[PDB]
Amino acid sequence: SIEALMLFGSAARGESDKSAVALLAVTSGVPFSKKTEQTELQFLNPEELLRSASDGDLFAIHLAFEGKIIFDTTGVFTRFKERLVIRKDYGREIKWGNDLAWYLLDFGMNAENTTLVNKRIAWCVRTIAIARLVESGKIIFSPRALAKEFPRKHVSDLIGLRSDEDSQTRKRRLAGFLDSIDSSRPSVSSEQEYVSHFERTENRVGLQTLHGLKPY
Amino acid sequence: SIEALMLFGSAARGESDNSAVALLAVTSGVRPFSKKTEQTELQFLNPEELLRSASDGDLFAIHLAFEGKIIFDTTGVFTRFKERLVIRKDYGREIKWGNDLAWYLLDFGMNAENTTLVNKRIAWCVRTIAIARLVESGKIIFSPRALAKEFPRKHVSDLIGLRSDEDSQTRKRRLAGFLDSIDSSRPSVSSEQEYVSHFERTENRVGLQTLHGLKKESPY
Amino acid sequence: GSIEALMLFGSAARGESDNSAVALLAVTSGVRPFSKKTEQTELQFLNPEELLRSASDGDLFAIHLAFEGKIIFDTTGVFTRFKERLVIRKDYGREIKWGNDLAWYLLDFGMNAENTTLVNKRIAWCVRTIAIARLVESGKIIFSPRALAKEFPRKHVSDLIGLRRDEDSQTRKRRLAGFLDSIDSSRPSVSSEQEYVSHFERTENRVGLQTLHGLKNEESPY
Amino acid sequence: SIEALMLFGSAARGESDKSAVALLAVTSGVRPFSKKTEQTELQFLNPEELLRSASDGDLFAIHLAFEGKIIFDTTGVFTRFKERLVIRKDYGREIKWGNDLAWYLLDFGMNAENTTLVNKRIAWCVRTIAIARLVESGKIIFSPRALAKEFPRKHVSDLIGLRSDEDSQTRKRRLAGFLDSIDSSRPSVSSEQEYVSHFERTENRVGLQTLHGLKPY
């Protein structure tokens, strides 16, 4: 009862660096994912997949724009694309990525799990860049393209294109990026105030990341 | 030579209905042309023209990006094409072209001898308006079946060829009801000659071609 | 090592739905052959040397990959080198004897095992293997169980490959013996269970050894 | 109505050079025909003829089954096609067709004005012989690059287009060297009209089309 299968992410674009071969299996009933060192198999049911198109999620836009359908026995990917509404305002997603970037600058740069911190920083930077580009009417997901289409300080370094520095250097790059996009910290200081801010603004990835410390 | 090849149109969506199998060959240097049989359309573009259609945000380029099935691409030209796409907020230029031609056909085309071309061009006008309005609202709809559902205006289904042999009286009132249901206004013209010069001033190529086709743009 | 190439195979590559699992072959340098499964997906890994070796050996799995696999991507050309290495043999007697010999062990010691679904699965593997190998010897490229039953219409093949049902242990053993009779099969010169083990070892019947020890690097359906 | 579509030939192998982009369209009721531009070939067959080529074990059907990329298939006809394939043990008929046409081209065709067509037909003869011999040995090779390695007879890589603006006597010496190296024998013919009747009696369809046009996958 896997009714449809799609290649997405870097392999869909024909990229090979970094990345991770990503496949989306559409199956009724059951949203988990099983991954190895270089593979990732995501499962979604049709209601969830269509909901992400209805909501205009950046991930849905990527699937519609770059996903390669391997098979589809039910037409669920046709219905997915017919439900897609690309929004004109991604300010909510942009603010989520801005706010989490400040959290990581303020509290994450000496964390034990450096790999997770670097990956979430990359997510913040990609999210801001993709969403800003969607607002201007362009559909860019490739990290190489993002650095050229969203020219801001250290974008290439931060989304992993250029990655084994020390804490001071990583923090300065992230601060230079945030200054370059004229970003300002939310009205918080402590980690606990970041938690409350993430809750009020319903920043799910911020909350997942903050507690986790305790790409396509 | 042929750098890349893409299935587009109805066969790219798995539709076999009026089912023209359409393939886009990207070939360096060559002018844009097409070789077509009863059931196939093989269209040739060079990379510069393909990328320009993306830069321009052409409806056809949006279709290729969101529905085209890449068969092969030896140069990455379809990646560069998608990175050049700029979807506009305002498709009023295309909408007015289809609107303006629709009024021409209403006024002068419904008694024309070439009934087939008239009905084909009416369907182009309606599909163009429907697709453009849906793109303005953030959607990626191109299937004629979906256009009728997603752009639920008067007589859309009949006017884009979803059955097909109605007389001249009936076809004219359907077109009139559609234009009314989208709050369309006839351009400031009356005679056929005034349409010609209006079509020329507004650079309505399809309008001029159609008008100068009824005397003496295929769906994707 | 990185994933050079990815191929859809098995029932999903044939457009056949069910139960069946979606099977995918990932080619990656360095790693030993291993699989990663869910209820409905099977992800197999091979390095290029092992993939090319199966082509050079004319393995039935390699023939299936070459004639039915759907390449999802291939950044190194490894699947072309694979196809250029395939040598389809005239004689699959060795594969046929493997399926024959495991069938006789199952007939003799497996029909009352508690793990009945594994026994039925391995019976189906024996029949499919014999059918596929005989058809390849005659120049055909058949792997779909539906088509196997029509192209290799020996006794009870449809039922023994799972194209129906479940019934009692008696009828199952009767069906299996009748299929072995219809292909003029003779039991190998063994009697006890350890004699089957030694015979599987001498003949290098990897699936026979895996099955026998499994009833008290596995074969994957395609 | 086109019920299925398949990419074949060099493009299906991800091979470029110049070799056209080739697509096979399956549509019912029509007789076989093709539409060609300089760089595309669009071949039309009905299901019955496609299935028949598989039952006959034609080299073209082997290539479609082994290397063709299905673009769409609304009826399952490519499945029934592959179930009908019987790969033969003996490709002597096809080998003799390629040998015989090679002798015609050597003895009568090298002087045709349409040198481009002659070189293409020579390459067809050499590829057909090599492919058929390899299939007899259980190998499924269609790529010209690989045919030259796996069937290394005299001048093979030259003759299948991997080297070509050579004059007529040079190309002629190469073809003669190839035929001698595979111990080929001229048919017992001594004129164009005798070649026509020989091609007819041996049912050498490509031979007859070549001769008449003078006088891929």
mmCIF file of C-alpha atoms in Angstrom, chain B:
data_model
loop_
_atom_site.group_PDB
_atom_site.id
_atom_site.type_symbol
_atom_site.label_atom_id
_atom_site.label_comp_id
_atom_site.label_asym_id
_atom_site.label_seq_id
_atom_site.Cartn_x
_atom_site.Cartn_y
_atom_site.Cartn_z
ATOM 1 C CA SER B 1 22.598 18.915 -31.294
ATOM 2 C CA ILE B 2 19.783 17.920 -28.902
ATOM 3 C CA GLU B 3 20.927 18.722 -25.356
ATOM 4 C CA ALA B 4 17.726 17.738 -23.551
ATOM 5 C CA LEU B 5 14.234 16.332 -24.070
ATOM 6 C CA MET B 6 11.084 16.825 -21.997
ATOM 7 C CA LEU B 7 7.600 15.313 -22.164
ATOM 8 C CA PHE B 8 5.025 18.071 -21.621
ATOM 9 C CA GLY B 9 1.340 18.718 -22.185
ATOM 10 C CA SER B 10 -1.398 16.183 -21.577
ATOM 11 C CA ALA B 11 0.841 13.113 -21.785
ATOM 12 C CA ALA B 12 3.071 14.549 -19.021
ATOM 13 C CA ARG B 13 -0.038 14.589 -16.802
ATOM 14 C CA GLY B 14 -1.118 11.084 -17.787
ATOM 15 C CA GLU B 15 -4.110 12.323 -19.826
ATOM 16 C CA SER B 16 -5.077 10.363 -22.953
ATOM 17 C CA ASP B 17 -8.188 12.285 -24.038
ATOM 18 C CA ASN B 18 -7.548 15.537 -28.144
ATOM 19 C CA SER B 19 -4.511 13.748 -26.686
ATOM 20 C CA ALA B 20 -1.514 15.226 -28.512
ATOM 21 C CA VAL B 21 1.760 13.676 -27.313
ATOM 22 C CA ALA B 22 4.151 16.600 -26.879
ATOM 23 C CA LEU B 23 7.927 16.618 -26.514
ATOM 24 C CA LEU B 24 10.300 19.569 -26.208
ATOM 25 C CA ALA B 25 13.770 19.108 -27.684
ATOM 26 C CA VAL B 26 16.366 21.640 -26.549
ATOM 27 C CA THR B 27 18.825 22.110 -29.393
ATOM 28 C CA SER B 28 21.635 24.632 -29.598
ATOM 29 C CA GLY B 29 21.536 27.297 -32.284
ATOM 30 C CA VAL B 30 18.383 26.177 -34.053
ATOM 31 C CA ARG B 31 15.402 28.473 -34.597
ATOM 32 C CA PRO B 32 12.097 27.526 -32.904
ATOM 33 C CA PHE B 33 10.023 25.128 -35.017
ATOM 34 C CA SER B 34 7.962 21.967 -34.575
ATOM 35 C CA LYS B 35 7.310 18.699 -36.419
ATOM 36 C CA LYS B 36 3.837 17.290 -35.822
ATOM 37 C CA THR B 37 1.798 14.273 -36.895
ATOM 38 C CA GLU B 38 -1.790 13.365 -36.012
ATOM 39 C CA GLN B 39 -0.843 12.293 -32.478
ATOM 40 C CA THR B 40 2.639 13.802 -31.877
ATOM 41 C CA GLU B 41 4.131 17.266 -31.531
ATOM 42 C CA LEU B 42 7.905 17.612 -31.416
ATOM 43 C CA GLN B 43 8.901 21.188 -30.548
ATOM 44 C CA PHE B 44 12.441 22.610 -30.821
ATOM 45 C CA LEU B 45 13.797 25.529 -28.758
ATOM 46 C CA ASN B 46 17.327 26.717 -28.214
ATOM 47 C CA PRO B 47 18.557 27.348 -24.641
ATOM 48 C CA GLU B 48 18.377 31.153 -24.924
ATOM 49 C CA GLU B 49 14.688 31.103 -25.920
ATOM 50 C CA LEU B 50 13.892 28.512 -23.265
ATOM 51 C CA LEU B 51 15.593 30.538 -20.531
ATOM 52 C CA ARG B 52 13.918 33.717 -21.819
ATOM 53 C CA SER B 53 10.472 32.120 -21.436
ATOM 54 C CA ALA B 54 11.414 31.444 -17.803
ATOM 55 C CA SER B 55 12.746 34.987 -17.212
ATOM 56 C CA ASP B 56 9.518 36.318 -18.750
ATOM 57 C CA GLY B 57 7.356 34.107 -16.521
ATOM 58 C CA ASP B 58 5.461 32.733 -19.523
ATOM 59 C CA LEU B 59 2.543 30.470 -18.618
ATOM 60 C CA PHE B 60 4.067 27.750 -20.835
ATOM 61 C CA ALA B 61 7.353 27.975 -18.919
ATOM 62 C CA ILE B 62 5.505 27.542 -15.612
ATOM 63 C CA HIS B 63 3.845 24.419 -17.054
ATOM 64 C CA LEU B 64 7.193 22.971 -18.154
ATOM 65 C CA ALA B 65 8.731 23.608 -14.750
ATOM 66 C CA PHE B 66 5.904 22.182 -12.643
ATOM 67 C CA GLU B 67 4.575 19.403 -14.908
ATOM 68 C CA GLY B 68 7.217 18.617 -17.543
ATOM 69 C CA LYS B 69 8.861 15.194 -17.319
ATOM 70 C CA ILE B 70 12.567 15.374 -18.157
ATOM 71 C CA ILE B 71 13.532 12.426 -20.333
ATOM 72 C CA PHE B 72 17.201 13.393 -20.529
ATOM 73 C CA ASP B 73 19.351 16.485 -20.006
ATOM 74 C CA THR B 74 23.053 16.205 -20.847
ATOM 75 C CA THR B 75 23.964 19.850 -20.153
ATOM 76 C CA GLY B 76 21.863 20.821 -17.153
ATOM 77 C CA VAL B 77 19.872 23.230 -19.322
ATOM 78 C CA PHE B 78 16.597 22.387 -17.492
ATOM 79 C CA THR B 79 18.205 23.273 -14.167
ATOM 80 C CA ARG B 80 19.295 26.651 -15.562
ATOM 81 C CA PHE B 81 15.763 27.048 -16.984
ATOM 82 C CA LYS B 82 14.149 26.478 -13.570
ATOM 83 C CA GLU B 83 16.619 28.789 -11.806
ATOM 84 C CA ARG B 84 15.667 31.542 -14.302
ATOM 85 C CA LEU B 85 11.913 31.227 -13.737
ATOM 86 C CA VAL B 86 10.260 34.357 -12.335
ATOM 87 C CA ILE B 87 6.548 33.841 -11.699
ATOM 88 C CA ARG B 88 4.839 37.207 -11.980
ATOM 89 C CA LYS B 89 2.151 38.636 -9.716
ATOM 90 C CA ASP B 90 0.334 40.320 -12.611
ATOM 91 C CA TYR B 91 -0.655 38.352 -15.724
ATOM 92 C CA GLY B 92 -2.972 41.138 -16.937
ATOM 93 C CA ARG B 93 -1.141 41.361 -20.256
ATOM 94 C CA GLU B 94 -1.962 37.740 -21.146
ATOM 95 C CA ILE B 95 -5.471 38.045 -19.678
ATOM 96 C CA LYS B 96 -6.247 41.114 -21.793
ATOM 97 C CA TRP B 97 -4.946 39.373 -24.930
ATOM 98 C CA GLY B 98 -7.294 36.445 -24.385
ATOM 99 C CA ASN B 99 -10.097 38.764 -23.325
ATOM 100 C CA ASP B 100 -9.659 40.994 -26.374
ATOM 101 C CA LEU B 101 -9.548 38.091 -28.831
ATOM 102 C CA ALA B 102 -12.602 36.563 -27.145
ATOM 103 C CA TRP B 103 -14.604 39.730 -27.888
ATOM 104 C CA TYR B 104 -13.356 39.714 -31.497
ATOM 105 C CA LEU B 105 -14.551 36.151 -31.989
ATOM 106 C CA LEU B 106 -17.886 36.887 -30.302
ATOM 107 C CA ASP B 107 -18.466 39.840 -32.614
ATOM 108 C CA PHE B 108 -17.164 38.392 -35.886
ATOM 109 C CA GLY B 109 -16.183 34.742 -35.604
ATOM 110 C CA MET B 110 -19.342 32.848 -34.728
ATOM 111 C CA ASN B 111 -20.603 32.761 -38.344
ATOM 112 C CA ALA B 112 -17.185 32.164 -39.904
ATOM 113 C CA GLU B 113 -16.678 29.258 -42.297
ATOM 114 C CA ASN B 114 -13.701 27.796 -40.404
ATOM 115 C CA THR B 115 -15.730 26.720 -37.390
ATOM 116 C CA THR B 116 -12.865 24.486 -36.230
ATOM 117 C CA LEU B 117 -10.359 27.330 -35.938
ATOM 118 C CA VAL B 118 -12.895 29.582 -34.191
ATOM 119 C CA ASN B 119 -13.641 26.952 -31.547
ATOM 120 C CA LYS B 120 -9.941 26.252 -31.125
ATOM 121 C CA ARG B 121 -9.191 29.939 -30.621
ATOM 122 C CA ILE B 122 -12.117 30.397 -28.220
ATOM 123 C CA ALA B 123 -10.637 27.567 -26.152
ATOM 124 C CA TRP B 124 -7.234 29.274 -26.229
ATOM 125 C CA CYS B 125 -8.808 32.518 -24.951
ATOM 126 C CA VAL B 126 -10.611 30.762 -22.092
ATOM 127 C CA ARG B 127 -7.694 28.515 -21.084
ATOM 128 C CA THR B 128 -5.350 31.519 -21.177
ATOM 129 C CA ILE B 129 -7.566 33.588 -18.888
ATOM 130 C CA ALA B 130 -8.208 30.677 -16.525
ATOM 131 C CA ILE B 131 -4.540 29.610 -16.257
ATOM 132 C CA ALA B 132 -3.357 33.205 -15.787
ATOM 133 C CA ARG B 133 -5.895 33.978 -13.045
ATOM 134 C CA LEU B 134 -5.018 30.761 -11.241
ATOM 135 C CA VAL B 135 -1.265 31.545 -11.466
ATOM 136 C CA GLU B 136 -2.019 35.021 -10.055
ATOM 137 C CA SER B 137 -3.675 33.270 -7.103
ATOM 138 C CA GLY B 138 -0.600 31.086 -6.544
ATOM 139 C CA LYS B 139 -1.689 27.897 -8.288
ATOM 140 C CA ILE B 140 -0.135 25.679 -10.940
ATOM 141 C CA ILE B 141 -3.190 24.473 -12.894
ATOM 142 C CA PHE B 142 -3.028 23.592 -16.594
ATOM 143 C CA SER B 143 -5.188 20.493 -17.195
ATOM 144 C CA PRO B 144 -8.395 21.550 -19.018
ATOM 145 C CA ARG B 145 -10.389 19.308 -16.643
ATOM 146 C CA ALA B 146 -8.887 21.029 -13.588
ATOM 147 C CA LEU B 147 -9.281 24.520 -15.099
ATOM 148 C CA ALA B 148 -13.036 24.067 -15.287
ATOM 149 C CA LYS B 149 -13.157 23.034 -11.609
ATOM 150 C CA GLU B 150 -10.642 25.552 -10.272
ATOM 151 C CA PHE B 151 -11.896 28.495 -12.421
ATOM 152 C CA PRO B 152 -15.650 27.791 -12.072
ATOM 153 C CA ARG B 153 -16.893 30.493 -14.416
ATOM 154 C CA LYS B 154 -19.854 30.273 -16.773
ATOM 155 C CA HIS B 155 -19.555 27.667 -19.574
ATOM 156 C CA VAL B 156 -15.780 27.151 -19.127
ATOM 157 C CA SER B 157 -16.099 23.375 -19.579
ATOM 158 C CA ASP B 158 -18.034 23.752 -22.849
ATOM 159 C CA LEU B 159 -15.723 26.457 -24.218
ATOM 160 C CA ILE B 160 -12.404 24.605 -23.783
ATOM 161 C CA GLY B 161 -13.544 21.541 -25.707
ATOM 162 C CA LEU B 162 -14.741 19.217 -22.922
ATOM 163 C CA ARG B 163 -17.748 18.415 -25.198
ATOM 164 C CA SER B 164 -18.835 19.881 -29.222
ATOM 165 C CA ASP B 165 -21.158 20.364 -32.213
ATOM 166 C CA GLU B 166 -23.500 23.113 -30.991
ATOM 167 C CA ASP B 167 -24.840 25.588 -33.548
ATOM 168 C CA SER B 168 -23.746 29.195 -34.017
ATOM 169 C CA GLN B 169 -26.497 30.704 -31.822
ATOM 170 C CA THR B 170 -25.682 28.434 -28.870
ATOM 171 C CA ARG B 171 -21.901 28.884 -29.082
ATOM 172 C CA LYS B 172 -22.196 32.689 -29.189
ATOM 173 C CA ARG B 173 -24.386 32.906 -26.081
ATOM 174 C CA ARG B 174 -22.070 30.558 -24.178
ATOM 175 C CA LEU B 175 -19.098 32.783 -25.001
ATOM 176 C CA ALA B 176 -21.153 35.847 -24.040
ATOM 177 C CA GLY B 177 -22.092 34.328 -20.680
ATOM 178 C CA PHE B 178 -18.462 33.472 -19.963
ATOM 179 C CA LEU B 179 -17.256 37.013 -20.679
ATOM 180 C CA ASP B 180 -20.093 38.314 -18.519
ATOM 181 C CA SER B 181 -19.235 35.924 -15.688
ATOM 182 C CA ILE B 182 -15.651 37.287 -15.601
ATOM 183 C CA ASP B 183 -16.881 40.937 -15.727
ATOM 184 C CA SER B 184 -15.164 41.444 -19.074
ATOM 185 C CA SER B 185 -15.461 44.666 -21.073
ATOM 186 C CA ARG B 186 -15.179 44.843 -24.840
ATOM 187 C CA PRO B 187 -12.205 46.999 -25.860
ATOM 188 C CA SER B 188 -13.128 50.359 -27.379
ATOM 189 C CA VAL B 189 -13.680 48.962 -30.898
ATOM 190 C CA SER B 190 -16.611 48.197 -33.169
ATOM 191 C CA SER B 191 -15.563 47.361 -36.752
ATOM 192 C CA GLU B 192 -13.272 44.484 -37.682
ATOM 193 C CA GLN B 193 -10.693 47.036 -38.856
ATOM 194 C CA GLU B 194 -10.786 48.624 -35.400
ATOM 195 C CA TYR B 195 -9.976 45.241 -33.854
ATOM 196 C CA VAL B 196 -6.986 44.883 -36.218
ATOM 197 C CA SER B 197 -5.431 48.190 -35.183
ATOM 198 C CA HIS B 198 -6.276 47.508 -31.539
ATOM 199 C CA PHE B 199 -4.644 44.083 -31.826
ATOM 200 C CA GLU B 200 -1.624 45.784 -33.395
ATOM 201 C CA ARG B 201 -1.304 48.564 -30.806
ATOM 202 C CA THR B 202 -1.627 46.057 -27.933
ATOM 203 C CA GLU B 203 0.770 43.590 -29.685
ATOM 204 C CA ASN B 204 -1.815 40.783 -29.660
ATOM 205 C CA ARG B 205 -0.056 38.359 -32.041
ATOM 206 C CA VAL B 206 -2.574 35.563 -31.554
ATOM 207 C CA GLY B 207 -5.350 38.074 -32.146
ATOM 208 C CA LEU B 208 -3.883 39.208 -35.463
ATOM 209 C CA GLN B 209 -3.055 35.626 -36.527
ATOM 210 C CA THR B 210 -6.608 34.503 -35.759
ATOM 211 C CA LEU B 211 -8.262 37.446 -37.503
ATOM 212 C CA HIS B 212 -5.950 36.993 -40.537
ATOM 213 C CA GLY B 213 -6.653 33.263 -40.375
ATOM 214 C CA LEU B 214 -10.412 33.384 -40.773
ATOM 215 C CA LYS B 215 -10.309 35.050 -44.202
ATOM 216 C CA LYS B 216 -10.354 33.747 -47.796
ATOM 217 C CA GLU B 217 -1.010 28.014 -29.627
ATOM 218 C CA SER B 218 -1.841 24.352 -29.208
ATOM 219 C CA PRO B 219 -3.059 23.217 -25.756
ATOM 220 C CA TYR B 220 -0.492 21.905 -23.253
#
